[PDB]
Ligand binder design. Structure first.
Ligand SMILES: COC(=O)c1ccccc1-c1cccc(C(=O)O)c1
Length: 242
């Protein structure tokens, strides 16, 4: 069962933006979205792909654990936090593309493709360059498809070891307080129109889990903070967080 709630559209329009929020109640196995059509429209995953990429890299031994240091290659890039050493935790936190591009190159096309099919991830198409296909290649995934993938990850049901899934879920840790835990990954797709921002993950409560996946038009980087802000307004409206 799915239900549409266009009242959430107010949260996007107050910022003159457009997008979709998709919520899934795990206990009740019920979904909610403001836009059933956009909820099933497929976009580039961009840095949300760092979830599956991390899983594959860990399971194949490309990444040993969350402490392995990936040394900066010495190339100054326009994002300051990228010009330093990183481990899996910080590379996720700061969405350090060049680290994951090296992951992908060491994974290779053949194993990457076979693993995304085992994950049933989006359209499972890695066409493009192995080190950027999730940024300007052929891979596509919808908001509802994100939730389906994240739900498997939460239950350790993806076709990789339990360890790899626990480690990635640790690396996804974004916020935690006395009321909730959020594990999620942001995304920013700019190389192919339409330019969008992602935020996908779930909300852990004492007695339930709310999975979420949102994307929204993002014509400039100035609005990236809206990905979390709009999502949280929906969570508040549905009384999922205070
Ligand atoms: C693809 O383009 C950028 O990533 C980008 C471009 C301009 C300014 C900032 C970023 C950036 C950097 C780090 C994280 C995020 C994010 O929140 O996913 C975004």
């Amino acid at each position: 069962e799915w239900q549409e709630n266009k009242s959430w559209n107010a949260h996007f329009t107050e910022h003159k933006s457009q997008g979709v929020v998709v919520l899934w109640n795990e206990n009740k196995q019920q979904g909610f979205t403001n836009n059933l059509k956009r909820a099933n429209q497929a976009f580039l995953p961009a840095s949300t792909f760092k979830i599956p990429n991390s899983l594959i890299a860990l399971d194949l031994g490309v990444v040993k654990d969350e402490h392995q240091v990936f040394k900066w290659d010495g190339q100054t890039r326009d994002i300051a936090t990228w010009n330093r050493d990183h481990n899996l935790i910080t590379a996720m936190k700061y969405s350090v593309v060049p680290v994951y591009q090296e992951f992908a190159r060491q994974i290779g096309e053949a194993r990457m493709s076979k693993m995304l099919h085992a994950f049933d991830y989006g359209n499972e198409d890695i066409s493009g360059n192995v080190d950027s296909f999730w940024l300007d290649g052929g891979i596509r995934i919808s908001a509802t498809e994100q939730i389906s993938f994240l739900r498997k990850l939460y239950h350790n049901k993806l076709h990789v070891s339990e360890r790899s899934q626990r480690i990635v879920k640790q690396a996804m840790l974004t916020e935690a307080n006395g009321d909730y835990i959020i594990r999620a990954k942001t995304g920013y797709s700019t190389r192919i129109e339409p330019k969008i921002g992602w935020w996908v993950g779930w909300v852990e409560l004492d007695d339930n889990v709310w999975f979420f996946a949102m994307n929204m038009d993002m014509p400039t980087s100035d609005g990236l903070g809206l990905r979390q802000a709009i999502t949280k307004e929906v969570l508040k409206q549905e009384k999922i967080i205070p």
